[PDB]
Amino acid sequence: DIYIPPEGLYFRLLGFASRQVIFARNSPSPDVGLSPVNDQATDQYFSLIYGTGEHAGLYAIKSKATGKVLFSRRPAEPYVGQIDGDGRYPDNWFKIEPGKTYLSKYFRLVQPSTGTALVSRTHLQPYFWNHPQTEVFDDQYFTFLFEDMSIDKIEYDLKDGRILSSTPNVLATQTLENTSSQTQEMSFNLSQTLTQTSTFAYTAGFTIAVGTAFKAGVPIFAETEFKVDISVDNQWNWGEENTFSKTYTATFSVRAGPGETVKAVSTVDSGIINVPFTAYLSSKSTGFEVTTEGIWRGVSSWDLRHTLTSVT
Amino acid sequence: DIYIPPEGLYFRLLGFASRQVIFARNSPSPDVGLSPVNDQATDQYFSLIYGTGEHAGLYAIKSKATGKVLFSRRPAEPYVGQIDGDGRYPDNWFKIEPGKTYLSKYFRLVQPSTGTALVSRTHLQPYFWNHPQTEVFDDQYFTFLFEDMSIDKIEYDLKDGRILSSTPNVLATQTLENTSSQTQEMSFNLSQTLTQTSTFAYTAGFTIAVGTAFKAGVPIFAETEFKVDISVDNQWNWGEENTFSKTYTATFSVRAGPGETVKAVSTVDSGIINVPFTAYLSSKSTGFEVTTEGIWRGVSSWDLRHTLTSVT
Amino acid sequence: DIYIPPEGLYFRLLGFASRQVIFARNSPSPDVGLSPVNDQATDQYFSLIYGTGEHAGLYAIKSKATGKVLFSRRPAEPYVGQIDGDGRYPDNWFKIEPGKTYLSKYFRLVQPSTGTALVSRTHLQPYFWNHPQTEVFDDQYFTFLFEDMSIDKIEYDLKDGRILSSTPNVLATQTLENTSSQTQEMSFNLSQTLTQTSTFAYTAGFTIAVGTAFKAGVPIFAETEFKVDISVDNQWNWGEENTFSKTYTATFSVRAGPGETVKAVSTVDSGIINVPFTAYLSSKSTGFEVTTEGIWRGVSSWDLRHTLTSVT
Amino acid sequence: DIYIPPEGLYFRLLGFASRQVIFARNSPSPDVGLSPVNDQATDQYFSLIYGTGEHAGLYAIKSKATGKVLFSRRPAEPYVGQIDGDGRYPDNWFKIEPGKTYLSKYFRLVQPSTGTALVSRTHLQPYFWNHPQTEVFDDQYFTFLFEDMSIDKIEYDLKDGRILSSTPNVLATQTLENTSSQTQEMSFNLSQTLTQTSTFAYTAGFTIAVGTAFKAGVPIFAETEFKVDISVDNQWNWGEENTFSKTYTATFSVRAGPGETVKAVSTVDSGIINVPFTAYLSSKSTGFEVTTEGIWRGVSSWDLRHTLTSVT
Amino acid sequence: DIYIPPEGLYFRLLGFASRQVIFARNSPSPDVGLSPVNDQATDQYFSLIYGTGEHAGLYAIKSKATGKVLFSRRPAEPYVGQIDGDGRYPDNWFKIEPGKTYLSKYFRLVQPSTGTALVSRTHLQPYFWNHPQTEVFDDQYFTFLFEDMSIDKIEYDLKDGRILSSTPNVLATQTLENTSSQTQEMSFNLSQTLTQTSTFAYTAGFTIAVGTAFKAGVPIFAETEFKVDISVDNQWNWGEENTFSKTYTATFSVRAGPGETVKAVSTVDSGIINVPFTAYLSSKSTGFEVTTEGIWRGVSSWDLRHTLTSVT
Amino acid sequence: DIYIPPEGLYFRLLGFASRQVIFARNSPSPDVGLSPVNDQATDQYFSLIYGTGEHAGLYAIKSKATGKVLFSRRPAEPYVGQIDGDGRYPDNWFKIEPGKTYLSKYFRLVQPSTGTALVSRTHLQPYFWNHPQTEVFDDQYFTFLFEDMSIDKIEYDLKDGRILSSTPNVLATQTLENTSSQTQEMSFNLSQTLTQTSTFAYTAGFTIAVGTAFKAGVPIFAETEFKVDISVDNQWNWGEENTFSKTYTATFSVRAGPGETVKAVSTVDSGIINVPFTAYLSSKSTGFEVTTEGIWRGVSSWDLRHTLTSVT
Ligand SMILES: CC(=O)N[C@@H]1[C@@H](O)[C@H](O[C@@H]2O[C@H](CO)[C@H](O)[C@H](O)[C@H]2O)[C@@H](CO)O[C@@H]1O
Ligand SMILES: CC(=O)N[C@@H]1[C@@H](O)[C@H](O[C@@H]2O[C@H](CO)[C@H](O)[C@H](O)[C@H]2O)[C@@H](CO)O[C@@H]1O
Ligand SMILES: CC(=O)N[C@@H]1[C@@H](O)[C@H](O[C@@H]2O[C@H](CO)[C@H](O)[C@H](O)[C@H]2O)[C@@H](CO)O[C@@H]1O
Ligand SMILES: CC(=O)N[C@@H]1[C@@H](O)[C@H](O[C@@H]2O[C@H](CO)[C@H](O)[C@H](O)[C@H]2O)[C@@H](CO)O[C@@H]1O
Ligand SMILES: CC(=O)N[C@@H]1[C@@H](O)[C@H](O[C@@H]2O[C@H](CO)[C@H](O)[C@H](O)[C@H]2O)[C@@H](CO)O[C@@H]1O
Numbered sequence A, B, C, D, E, F: 001d002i003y004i005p006p007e008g009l010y011f012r013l014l015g016f017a018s019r020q021v022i023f024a025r026n027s028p029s030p031d032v033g034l035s036p037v038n039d040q041a042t043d044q045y046f047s048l049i050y051g052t053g054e055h056a057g058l059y060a061i062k063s064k065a066t067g068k069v070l071f072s073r074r075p076a077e078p079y080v081g082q083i084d085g086d087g088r089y090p091d092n093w094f095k096i097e098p099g100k101t102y103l104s105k106y107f108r109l110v111q112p113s114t115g116t117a118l119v120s121r122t123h124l125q126p127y128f129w130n131h132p133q134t135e136v137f138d139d140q141y142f143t144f145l146f147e148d149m150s151i152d153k154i155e156y157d158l159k160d161g162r163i164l165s166s167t168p169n170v171l172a173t174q175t176l177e178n179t180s181s182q183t184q185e186m187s188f189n190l191s192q193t194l195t196q197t198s199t200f201a202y203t204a205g206f207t208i209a210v211g212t213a214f215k216a217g218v219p220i221f222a223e224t225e226f227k228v229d230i231s232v233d234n235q236w237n238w239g240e241e242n243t244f245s246k247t248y249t250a251t252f253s254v255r256a257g258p259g260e261t262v263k264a265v266s267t268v269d270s271g272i273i274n275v276p277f278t279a280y281l282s283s284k285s286t287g288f289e290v291t292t293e294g295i296w297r298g299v300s301s302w303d304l305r306h307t308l309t310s311v312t
């Protein structure tokens, strides 16, 4: 159920076939066409104008560089281009039509009243053009390539954490020292590292770009609740599985019995854990805010136990 | 070990390099060439004719629109095109050669007797042509883009279900009401929702398109067996992980002891579960049937328990 | 380590051999001798006068009826009898000497300065006499047959309770009723009786007579602590094992799911339990107080559980 | 299956009815008769002479003081008494006949060839006499009152130890100290006392007198084996249940994590335990050796555990 | 709550003090008096005649040898004796008065209308006499010494069996044989003996004599129920703890894997078990029937397990 | 943190936009340009020359076919091409600049001193050219398409294996045969197949091409350690999840008890398992060696148990 951006968010319109983006400028000569991505080119950014009235459910595509809006028509030439007036003409309103299968993240930009669909191709000219909406070709599909967004915050819904698996893992058994009887001090040292896992999966809301790099703040099961381990300072990649080391350190001493051989077994509960969360983002150029819901999942550890027992 | 369709199933031949499909028509002028996908164009569909005799193991590619077969030769011009007779000429028989790595779902269409390989590119003309089979280039690879198939049924192999993980999850503890002694009624209400998971992974047989949308029928562990929960009415996407809510509802009352404070703990076993299955499909245009084996996997819950205990 | 009564407590001196008790009266003629027990005869009761000075560690035996004290001598005749003055003569001081084996609850009453030991027999006259302390015969042994004491209170040392064994016992499984789906009410009834056990064992202090009948107040394990079940109104016999019935009663109803067959399993933890205690007693004739420490032991039950589960 | 002493062991013959013992001396006048027990009187001790030949299975009763043997006859007077020659006359051989119920530890001493049974009573004279073996009266029963035996050793059959019950008992939970983070030392102290139980029950062999006092050496479950705790220095009473204190002492320190609140739970497994054993005894006057098999039973504790866990 | 025999059951009246029994014959001269027990003497047996009308709640004591009834009066001499007419005179009706403590199994035989209590002593004549009921002495107490009864049957109330403790006991671990790979046969043998325990404790009904010897039929826990092991052919002693051996025997073979070292662990659940029961008895001389309820208790074993596991 | 190949390893430079590779030959005429991949064309292979001195951190791109190095300049024409001298000119040194998001596996090849960036496109000529480094377009990105490498060995770091989940799965219960008593032989057969899982995930080091086919050697949990099952002979695909069958076979016989019905339950522990590993590879053309660290993960089974129990 596709995410369409609200009015103040910018994006590029990437064509499935052309693998190129639409541009709209005042000059040079060709004012609208296709181009390889250049994040710094205002020329390639657009935002949507939500139609109202008989246009409710449709959208106008406003150029960020020129402020003009796109149009698609069949009678007059050229069939596509820019024009003033934020949607003054019926030629400026488009219906966003999601594709299926390999095109489920893509969609056509069909302008109803003229029965025309936007075209983006590099195999035939004009590269940026339109076609009778009834004949569907793959080069009529577009996807959103949103503006660079900064992930400002991650807020976990700890109350809804969940243990998906759990098996005890003995970190260190050995660590058993003796001295017959009397003695006095027997201290142990524990330093075990476990490779943990982390994945921030999209659930709903703003569609963050896969691989987006952001930082720390990862879930942990306490003993009766889930909590956030602010120490994990690794760099995460949105939508992808990352790994990180967790080291358990501990030092404890014993000796006080009639005379025994002390054994120390350090154990932890390891397993798969997951927690819901909400991410807060804002436009780097505008500060425009949005949110994204997601579920965080990972292999983790909890309940570090130290068991002491004497022998003879 | 690549899936080659039987004789009555249609498909498009998508080129790795051109990202375009082969077409074969009677008119306009250029009767065979490349084109962006248009699912409604019979022009782009083909089926295979299984070679026999000295042609066993080879195939002819029959156009659905014209009924003619493709050919690849080096002497006479043009080197590729259409021709009558379901494989009358040695020029019509092809060897399907699977690629590796990034080309493991692709293959070359090599016509042995002429030592020629089909070509599909957009960087050089002719776009649809052939090349000496000994010199291998990426633009010689094709993949099947099968006709739209309807998923008519999913039959789970319940006897072979399997619990991959299991940990108790307390849905609701609290829910403990008192009234000292005497009293008479103490009823509790349980309404807890768990986000479940679902994935239909391909194992063998017909290669269903990733993302194909179909409906319900998902596995559940009873107490000693696996069963199908027909209530889950969510829309699934083949080959992809989906999520769905499961709500546990229950109402029970107590009170009948010498006078106590009743506590109610509702618990469930949550964990990863998987089950084998077979999907039955048919051509939307023909009704031609095929099957696909797969393994279904998901995070689930089972064995809802309600424990009652008095206090003082 | 024998219990010798303090100065204000009365008792009878029962002879091992004679199986008769010593009496001391002013009249009839024979003022001191032996007699079968008659609890109402003041004639048979005595109390001890704790020696001091060079008599510390020795005792005088004062008659309750006459107030006179017993004496044991060898020169003058008769060798035993009564005399005024609470221990005026060296003839009135006795050493209490515990026996062993079958005589561990008995003891000789040896009067040191004369080297004489009290005698209590029915096979030879005089029945009540003495003998040279160096020649030990069984008829020189006595035991205390204390005055009737009332058990006023039992105070358990709950903090020190202890579970000696524990095994779950299913009181009632069956109790599973259905009605397919919809329905609305499904209430269960539980009434199970377990034969419990109870024994009040002597540990130290006043030696209560075995079989003494007294009432209620018996230990029970709560969930984290031991508590006293004041409901058990059975009559106990000190030092002996008693039995008593414990009935578990409960009524609870369910039904609120999409439609299932409800099962109810009522379970308890049964096992051996024991707890230390102190008993407070007083003389029925005097009100003289004493205490007795003991350990209470018994087969019991705890943690009644009711588990609800649906089926299909 | 009654224990009859071998030839070199001495005993007294206690009568059920008379509750007196048989004596055989050279002087004064009455050389054989009844008497209250006097352990120092050689006069009351006897040993058995195992019959052989046609007397196999019968026994002669030899006086320790005079060395003569007892006889029972009907023609000549007196019917019972002493005589020289270790069983020269048929009058000296007796059949030991065990009684039942309240007489299961008693037996008649029947002299077959004369059809006479020994009598021991105080209600009619002669007190020590005989009666026609066919008419059985309670005063014809005797029991062995063996000479004082010293318990020299107890050897447990550890390999055959057995846990009859087992339940964890938390000795001390609390003992949890914090200091936020950093800190450095957090040591705990454990001192918990449990009242243990001990009983040495007769199984076979020499019948040790109930209540016989002897010392230490009591079973304990290690972790995989049973062992003897030589520290328990309490005084035991054969055949009776004794109690003794067991104190667990321990001191251990921790602190070494990123900063937590340490909790320490000391736990033990308590339950009923039993082990077979053999006791070695010898005559205090002779050094004559014998053994006694038995099973030792008691409430004990094992596997002291110390579990460390941090909190926040 | 003392067991008084119904009309057709015979018994002896044993005196607490005299430790002798009452006899009633037609000749010799003294027709009623005291005597040491002689089970074969009809002379010592009596049965009760349950009073009715104004005598309801009282009893007459009928001699088995003479058929006459006992009487207790104060005016006429002798005060006690025999008389014809099954209770014709008011002198023949007695009130049975249970004692307490050491006399809880004894009772006085008080004849109300004359205010007299039966006496049984050997320290003063007449030995069998009576006394003013208001002055209570120990020699006024009697207890029942019932006729020899045969235990014909024991019927356990299996449904009410109960596990009081339970701990796994490994009978034999070792028994692990290898041969690398291939091989073919690896059979194990199990022969382990456990010393079990058995006690038949009185609960209610006929008071069987302690120590009474009878045979087999002992409880066992199956897997979900209790059953009777008819194989245990040991001789039991009523009211006392007995022991008996239980041997577990088993032979099983394996070998069929890719090549491993087989280990076999034979384990059982041992613990304390108890079950209610009813015993059926009858008079050896009459066949008169009675029952006795009781609880059976013992250390037992159940659920023999054999676990097979390979190694490398 | 991108993997840049050391000096002796060859690769192709695939353009993000052109999806074509760079070639450098001596003839025909155009000596440098773009081309679809042809693994056999030496023409398309290059290796890097690690800059030193003021060029440390930069690289020269040496053609394998010609041995010449690439250059990028702005003054002189053509702006890009080949040249002798392994980095003689400042024009030959490039900075490798990793992209983000969809370009995280791609990078620009920027030549600093001229402020120029390599270009690879098919939408505008020249296809292989350069651009002012300050204006970034997607067609400036390249990725490594390494030479075919052979996976010579996989060495698991068994000591660091880890159980992520664990749940018992009963392979076969039923298999329970009887014959009442006596009998003699009762053998069982076990043959159960479980579909296991396997995935070799990249962690660090050489970036093996996804899908690369190689063979066997997969982890297994023993009982206390992880070991390699050399039997699994399946073909794996690097970076992708594969499946494989595991069959448990076993034959064992019993019968040796007093007469029972034998039941056999075969059980295993199934769950998710993972283990670190290092793969050793070498160039197929050179033998040049490299390594790749990775974590192996899969659904597995361990601890096959066979439990034997009798019934009646
Ligand atoms: C200038 C103009 O009107 N040109 C059009 C062509 O674009 C058009 O070609 C097709 O356009 C579709 C767009 O979805 C596909 O790109 C397809 O491959 C093209 O064939 C033809 C009619 O087909 O008409 C004019 O020439
Ligand atoms: C009309 C004709 O015969 N043309 C051919 C060219 O197609 C051929 O070019 C190559 O074809 C392969 C196909 O796998 C690749 O597309 C490659 O990039 C092309 O260079 C050349 C010979 O190379 O010969 C004729 O011109
Ligand atoms: C009156 C008097 O002095 N009589 C004594 C006897 O009592 C005494 O007899 C013994 O006393 C002891 C007491 O422990 C035992 O009862 C034993 O059975 C008796 O024999 C004798 C000496 O033995 O002397 C006087 O007769
Ligand atoms: C000297 C002599 O021969 N006396 C006997 C009596 O002892 C005997 O009395 C009985 O003996 C038995 C012994 O088991 C019981 O003690 C019983 O109570 C006595 O009655 C009588 C015969 O009965 O004969 C002689 O008098
Ligand atoms: C023949 C006669 O009447 N004798 C009685 C005695 O028996 C009686 O003695 C007491 O009887 C009681 C019975 O409970 C105890 O045995 C006690 O020890 C005896 O003293 C006396 C009165 O006491 O009267 C007559 O002599």
Ligand SMILES: CC(=O)N[C@@H]1[C@@H](O)[C@H](O[C@@H]2O[C@H](CO)[C@H](O)[C@H](O)[C@H]2O)[C@@H](CO)O[C@@H]1O
Pocket: A035, A036, F119, F121, F124, F125, F126, F129, F130, F131, F136, F137, F139, F140
């Ligand atoms: C021969 C020459 O110098 N040509 C250049 C063009 O390549 C250049 O065009 C752009 O190049 C970038 C490379 O990152 C993109 O491909 C972009 O789409 C092109 O517009 C133009 C200046 O833009 O200048 C010359 O014509």
